[PDB]
A paper describes a structure:
To understand the molecular features that enable hla_bga to adapt to high salinity/low temperature polyextremophilic conditions, we determined the crystal structure of hla_bga at a resolution of 2.5 Å, using the molecular replacement method. Hla_bga forms a homo-trimer where each monomer contains three domains: domain A, an (β/α)8 TIM barrel fold domain (residues 1–390); domain B, an α/β fold structure with five helices and eleven β-strands (391–614); and domain C, an anti-parallel β-sandwich structure comprising four β-strands and one helix (615–700). As a trimer, hla_bga resembles a bowl with a central opening that has a width of about 25 Å at the rim, ~40 Å in the center and 7 Å at the bottom. The three monomers of hla_bga are tightly bound to each other by extensive hydrogen bonding. Each chain of hla_bga has 18 hydrogen bonds and four salt bridges that contribute to the inter-chain interactions The solvent-accessible surface area buried in the trimer structure of hla_bga is 10,083 Å2, which constitutes 43.1% of the trimer surface area. Finally, hla_bga contains two unusual surface loop regions, one in domain B (residues 532–543) and the other in domain C (656–674). Electron density for these loops was missing, inferring that they were highly flexible. These two loop regions contained an increased number of acidic amino acids (42% in the loop region compared to 18.6% overall protein structure), illustrating the convolution of halophilic and psychrophilic features. Firstly, hla_bga is highly acidic, having a 5–7% excess of acidic residues over basic residues compared to psychro-, meso- and thermophilic homologs. In hla_bga it is caused by the lower number of lysines and a higher number of aspartic and glutamic acids compared to its homologs. It is particularly pronounced at the hla_bga surface, displaying 33.6% acidic residues.
Author numbering:
A (entry chain A), B (entry chain A), C (entry chain A): 1 to 531, 544 to 656, 673 to 696
The structure:
């Protein structure tokens, strides 16, 4: 709908200021976000303040018809503050303090930093509460980036001890809940508990999961401090945060419980590089992967059951990934329309102009170093016009749900049982099989209500609380069916095994138990056939069908030969399928298409690997991350978003096509 | 002969206790080992003790006819003790203290820990000295695991200084023995010597070897403290320890000098993964490598010249190696019979039931999580019956010897001169060539007497003491012949070069000197022909035949072309062959078969790669780690151990076959 | 011209002393360098001194007709000094002190060490000022080796603060020159600046470049202390230093500004191993790469515009590289003649005899361990005779120049924008293309005067000072043409971007601007054709020809398809070509041959990959690093240096051929 850009008047002289806001008006960007790293300029020394620049900045943003979203400067305390109160910095487990010289050099549990966040944010919000045309506020900047969610300092130790006391009540319930008899790891009292440090072997899984939950909850409380004082300033303002893609350390659900709108930063070409399982391909090197960006879009939309923003959007070549080839022609228009299809009503590009200045010189902006426009500006203008023309897009609703569980993520990160195992890649297999049929997908936590969904897929439900278990049993008994992936129903809320066999509380919600599991180097032939041969990847679980009906068996020809691999069971009205195998493309597509068959939804035929389509409101969007070409027959030119006989429409490389009418179709 | 299991009543409720000991009686396991990690349960706080559970435990083990072997709880001091006396923990070279949160968090040289080992072990042995049916005692648990042999704390510094003074007498003998003039590294006094810490370049080889010897001797004295007080408790008891496979940091010979029986922990599928040189193959992924497990069996048997135990045996899937595929059908029966062939009279499986509890949840037991039996239980029962039926097996004696020298191992670990060089792999090449002919092999230190051996193979004798040198000269003059590998006769007892050329004290016990040596990336063609072409690996030493007779020359076609590679010489009665080359399979087999020719022993024809046979007492065992099948004609069905015309016997995948009669044969 | 050896009488008994100096006379080595690591022997305790050995040593070196070059023992302070004043040692960023146990364990900024360098060097030079036959002095030993240029201790912190104050005057000029507004990184005062330590993300580029310049300048001042007191001792003496190959941390130009002769250590087989981009080939494993050793030869010759020495030369197999295969037959004669061709008048081999002693036992010498000669001795004798026969070789002058900029090196090391990017490899591509035509090349800093050069090549001029810019414009306007590589004209003296587009101050000295740049994984097809198809590597810069004339365009067929890749422009008299691409062998050779066409120099036809020729004085040298054979027709046998009809001369594997007459030729 609306577009924007992340501006930094801090770096540029004030002569360029109004001409640049004028260009930002020319492009059609109705939002401008600044003041992230402006603490050092505002307070050069303690007691001295320099607000006026931002005032004029806001003025010009309001002079040209855009509303500016401001942010707390907490991400970068200046050097005088760090030298003044060194206790604010964090420590990694062996105790080395993460110094100044970059961003994110503070600890979420140091009461000192709480005091001075209070001071600085109080003074910056009271300057702007009622009068000016600021739109809302965003918390610090990318909470927990550079692995700053978990600190092992002594302030975190005290916070950990009281968090533990609050969770468990007394020491004996902790010892029996984690079960500390193995390797005589019982705690005599809560003080005897230290944040995990260097030790000869692995750390206790319940201990590590407790510390992960503790770190994420610490940052949730810090964010609530932020949001409390922001709401204190002006009741109309929204509070929001910019999260990151494929980020494991911060539970965005609970922190989003404290805000009004959700935002995140997407850089497709960079994240397709970061050992996205397998070698990043050229078209991926220039456009990214539609499914990684898409799952992040869905996870941040379904946070509040409301549309989201993308607070930072890749403008061109960036600096952090190993290589950064030039993205394809119109890749930014492509990403904007991708986010718009996935639910974003605002897309703000980072940044306005390439910074000549810091350790991000190799990060482009919508403008060059000259003040000349970069490719980002042109594509931003084009997507602006098309966003205007296509309607006041509604909030998508997904018929299918995938349950994303940060606790399962952390617990398996602690115990992968394979070097090539990754929760992100598993959820990606299942979710991308569902999206390869063309549906809109919702990814949610166990907290959400599973009613109102045709089908649900739970690739990893590692820890199953029994309330969650009977909720799913009643959903499958009364409503649609479910597809569970491998490694679900293994541990409890305390990351502990059950006296029963896998999948514990779900064992009767499926037709089988699990004899045992094995982890496989991806060097062995790993196939399944149906009881045609498809291959699976990295993981196998032998199914003991006690209730009923194996579907796929192992043609692996090892010691698991001929044993059930996939299973189905019809408990009452509605079904349940269990996949004890990490499926490759074909098997996952078969499972997805069949579950979609069972739930009367309108899956399109197998869309190509770099082609994704989504129905928002009434219109439907086809985003082409492939650089070849696409041709959809069966649809004549009545499309709203088109580029500059009736044989369909042709969607060029990195192009979008918005069409109305919720299709069941194929293409190229 | 007898079977067992490592039980932990600590984890399980006492209602399952007698039913589980009843099942352990059903399987036929006459030994039960517990109390390893029970310090935290016994002494929850200082002065408070909780013995009674173990009492009843022992009672039930004695109620059902099995003798229980107990162990000191020293491996895991509880948190209250660590917080009480933090000085007990270790430090790695840069000085970071290895905290609590795992096992093995103590230092062998901290007098504090000596005091409290005295306290706890005194109190636990006096509880059981004369009266109950405990069988013997095992020291802590896997001494030095997780790299805990070498600590760099200050207590170790004092222990190192006095160990050095005891070895060298005065500072000047140390300086001249290590020769500290290079890089002006001379010590003015013994206090000027610090345990090795961070330094810009490598560390002195004599210094590092001194510290390795010092760490291992420190743990030998700790073990002698243990054994002294155990023998103090009951004169009948045996003292033993559980060592590890392919473990370089602890000299098991000298610590075994302090005990009565030797035991070790075998997990074949896991250790075949740990960069066992080359990619672990599928049949290896499910059965392991017969030669690695076999050399460990031999090294721990020949420790006391007595049979050994395998205190921990893989029950199924385990947790530590990167991947853990399900082992083959009957792999545990296979490992039990493998150890029985190699000399083990007791084989105790770890553990009884998969622990639901600690950081080893992914480690199976003989029973499932349900209390249901796992594959391990069934295979344990089957091997129990066959162990009963085949006789009261004798102690094997080997005709051939391989000299394993921990000092050579440490010295070459400090100076590999190649990234792909490994003492384990070299000894494996030679030993496996000998075993591929079907013999029983003894692996011993230079301390042992070399008489009573048809032939001897010394792959790496890096440090040759002159007493050892004339012992070998008299052995070769009066008795059998020897085969020396590369890098023998290079340094003295002080890890220092000789003024002479290689191999120093042995130069006249062989026909040649060594012109020079080269290290080779395994990318170049590395062949030898005899003076048909076989390939060698990673190492070459040009031989200068001064006395006599090159056998193999270099067809490598480099600057070493045509120079002697292998050599033979007949000093008196009996011969000596020197292999200045790391031989691949074919060359090593030729050398092994020929040395066996020279010593009138009964080598069988080349057995397949995953097939190993051994003659214990009167019976001989063929263990098949291959999953194909095996067929031995020339032997009709009179076999003792067989699975459930006369064309031989067929040994299926992962099967054993015990036959009587010391064969010279081939197979499949 | 003259040969030598690096002797250590410290290790050997004095009985071998005169026989070894006699052998050194036999070989013809007129220089002997000792006293590097002799501090521990000289001063065993403080106040006690033991000079006499060296006296006799010098005597014998003078008794047999050779002049001995001595060195300060500063590289290895003994243990008593380190224990006495521990503050002398260095610290790496997280603060761990680099202990004793190796060499180079001192800090260049600790005033303590300045005091005791003064003490020890004063006492060692006054012992020898006027009377004896020592030739000159060499500073410590390989300054900064094992990464000891940059220390992060507190003494370095104070030195850094005052160096910064001296460079910038006040804090505000530093903040605006580095531009510290990004991530609020401004400094309130110079004390607020700490040497870079652990921080969650990257460090500021200007900050890191400042610290690199600071470390190198610190060692320049330490070297000036050394040289000042050496010149104080005897006015006739020369001061020199031994630098290293491919060494990035020490600016040899500025330290050479303080000495009279330049020396360096060449080990070709070892450095061709150290991830010299690509797999080191067999002939490289035995001879090295002529271009890496050659560029180091040129960089150390052009330091003072005078000939150089090679203070350490590989004698045979060495210890530091991963593998060390035996070098080819006569490889040392080959290296000696290679250095002689490149300008070395003295070549001193390290070392005399393999040290039996320290952590370098696996490093050969010219003699074996026996005191027997090694291959090095024979080849040293042969190259001695030929050096005598061929004339009193002059100082080479190069017609072409390559600008090597340590600041560009450090700045791109901080921001490679690619994992496979390396300043050494880029300069190697261009320089080796020039040498593959057979010319002599000079590699110099921007400090040197560019007049007197037919053509100049600047592969990376990352930071262009405007004085440098107008110097190059006037050179191209009045004289020859230039070839600029990628990533030149990007930042200023402060490592900051310009408000203009690339290449900033050079934008009108070339026909184009730079649209943008991309980094490429070497997995994509990366070609160019001329406006036949050659391939490029790892880097591309789209050229916007505003002034004139693209030569090569992109046949890569991506989003950069058809855009100019190489460009040429004729500003006045003389031309300029810009290569926005990292060229592979063929493209680089085309560019080199064409620039040589433009400058009327006598390039020979494409010489093979392991063949290098150079014209020193009147004679010209062809060094064959290839092991095949070479045949030069068109030249009959009148050659001066030849090995033991008229169809040319044949140069065998690893042979030299010195011929007179400055050729334009081809070969094999
Ligand atoms: Mg700690
Ligand atoms: Mg230390
Ligand atoms: Mg610091
Ligand atoms: Zn912290
Ligand atoms: Zn210690
Ligand atoms: Zn320092």
């Amino acid at each position: 709908m609306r577009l924007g850009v992340c501006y930094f008047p801090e770096h540029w002289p004030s002569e360029e200021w109004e001409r640049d806001v004028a260009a930002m008006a020319d492009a059609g960007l109705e939002y401008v976000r600044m003041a992230e790293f402006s603490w050092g300029v505002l307070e050069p020394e303690r007691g001295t303040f320099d607000f006026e620049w931002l005032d004029e900045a806001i003025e010009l943003i309001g002079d040209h018809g855009m509303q500016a979203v401001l942010c707390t400067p907490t991400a970068t305390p200046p050097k005088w503050l760090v030298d003044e109160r060194p206790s604010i910095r964090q420590e990694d487990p062996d105790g080395t303090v993460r110094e100044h010289g970059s961003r994110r050099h503070y600890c979420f549990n140091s009461d000192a930093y709480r005091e001075e966040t209070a001071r600085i944010v109080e003074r910056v919000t009271e300057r702007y509460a009622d009068s000016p045309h600021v739109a809302g506020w965003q918390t610090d900047n990318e909470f927990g980036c550079h692995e700053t969610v978990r600190c092992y300092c002594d302030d975190c130790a005290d916070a950990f001890r009281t968090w533990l006391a609050d969770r468990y009540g007394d020491i004996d319930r902790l010892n029996e809940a984690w079960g500390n008899a193995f390797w005589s790891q019982q705690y005599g009292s809560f003080d005897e508990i230290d944040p995990p440090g260097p030790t000869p072997a692995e750390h206790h899984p319940s201990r590590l999961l407790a510390y992960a939950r503790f770190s994420s909850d610490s940052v949730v409380e810090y964010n609530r401090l932020h949001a409390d004082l922001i709401r204190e300033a002006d009741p109309d303002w929204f509070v929001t945060h910019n999260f990151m893609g494929r980020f494991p350390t911060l539970n965005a659900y609970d922190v989003s419980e404290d805000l009004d709108r959700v935002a995140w930063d997407s850089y497709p070409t960079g994240f397709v590089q970061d050992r996205y399982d397998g070698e990043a391909s050229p078209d991926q090197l220039r456009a990214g992967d539609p499914d990684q960006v898409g799952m992040d879009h869905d996870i941040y939309r379904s946070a509040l059951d409301r549309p989201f923003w993308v607070m930072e959007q890749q403008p061109g070549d960036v600096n952090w990934p190993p290589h950064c080839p030039q993205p394809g022609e119109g890749a930014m228009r492509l990403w904007a329309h991708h986010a718009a299809a996935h639910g974003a009503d605002a897309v703000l590009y980072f940044r306005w102009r390439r910074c000549l200045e810091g350790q991000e010189q190799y990060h482009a902006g919508l403008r060059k170093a000259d003040g000349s426009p970069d490719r980002g500006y042109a594509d931003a203008a084009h997507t602006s016009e098309e966003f205007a023309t296509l309607d006041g897009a509604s909030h998508v609703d997904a018929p299918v749900a995938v349950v994303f569980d940060y606790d399962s993520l952390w617990a398996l990160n602690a115990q992968p049982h394979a070097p090539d195992f990754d929760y992100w890649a598993l959820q990606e297999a299942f979710y991308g099989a569902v999206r390869g049929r063309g549906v809109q997908v919702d990814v949610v936590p166990p907290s959400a209500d599973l009613s109102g969904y045709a089908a649900v897929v739970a690739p990893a439900l590692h820890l199953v609380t029994e309330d969650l278990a009977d909720r799913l049993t009643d959903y499958i008994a009364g409503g649609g069916e479910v597809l569970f992936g491998p490694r679900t129903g293994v541990k409890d809320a305390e990351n502990k095994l059950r006296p029963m066999s896998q999948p514990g509380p779900l064992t009767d919600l499926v037709g089988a138990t699990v004899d045992q599991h094995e982890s496989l180097p991806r060097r062995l032939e790993t196939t399944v056939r149906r009881v045609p041969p498809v291959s699976f990847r990295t993981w196998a679980e032998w199914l003991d069908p006690d209730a009923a009906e194996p579907q796929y068996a192992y043609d692996v020809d090892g010691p698991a030969d001929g044993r059930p691999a996939v299973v189905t069971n019809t408990v009452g009205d509605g079904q349940v399928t269990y996949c004890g195998v990490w499926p490759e493309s074909d098997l996952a597509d078969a499972l997805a298409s069949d579950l979609l068959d069972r739930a009367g939804v309108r899956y399109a035929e197998r869309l190509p690997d770099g082609v994704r389509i989504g129905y928002r409101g009434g219109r439907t969007w086809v985003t082409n991350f492939t650089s070849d070409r696409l041709r959809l027959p069966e649809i004549d030119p009545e499309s709203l978003a088109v580029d500059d006989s009736a044989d369909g429409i042709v969607v060029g490389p990195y192009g979008v096509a918005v069409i109305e009418g919720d299709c069941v179709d194929g293409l190229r």
